[PDB]
């Protein structure tokens, strides 16, 4: 006699990577990469209407 045991397959998947610029939210914001925030305590914007 013989009785064996088998792996009939292996299945992985793939993470999706989402950019945030391919979205519709990135219109809601003006993004900019500011290298040292850790150095600036207070930032301000001004409005004259």
């Amino acid at each position: 006699d013989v009785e064996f045991d088998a792996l009939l397959g292996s299945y992985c998947n793939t993470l999706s990577l989402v950019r945030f610029l391919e979205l519709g939210l990135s219109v809601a914001c003006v993004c900019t990469k500011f290298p040292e925030l850790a150095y600036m305590n207070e930032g301000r914007v001004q409005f004259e209407v």
Binding site: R44, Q46, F47, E48, V49
Partner: protein, 45 residues
């Protein structure tokens, strides 16, 4: 907290435009510093 004043003269070269037209007094509180200047004030010079 004595808000740090508005820096006129940095606004002498604005970086953009405001597309709303509203009386901003209603929304007053959402700003750190705010003035209401009628015509001209001595403190802008």
């Amino acid at each position: 907290r004595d808000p740090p004043g508005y820096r006129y003269a940095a606004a002498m070269v604005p970086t953009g435009s405001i597309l709303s037209t509203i009386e901003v007094a209603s929304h007053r509180r959402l700003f750190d510093f705010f003035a209401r200047v009628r015509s001209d004030e001595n403190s802008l010079y």
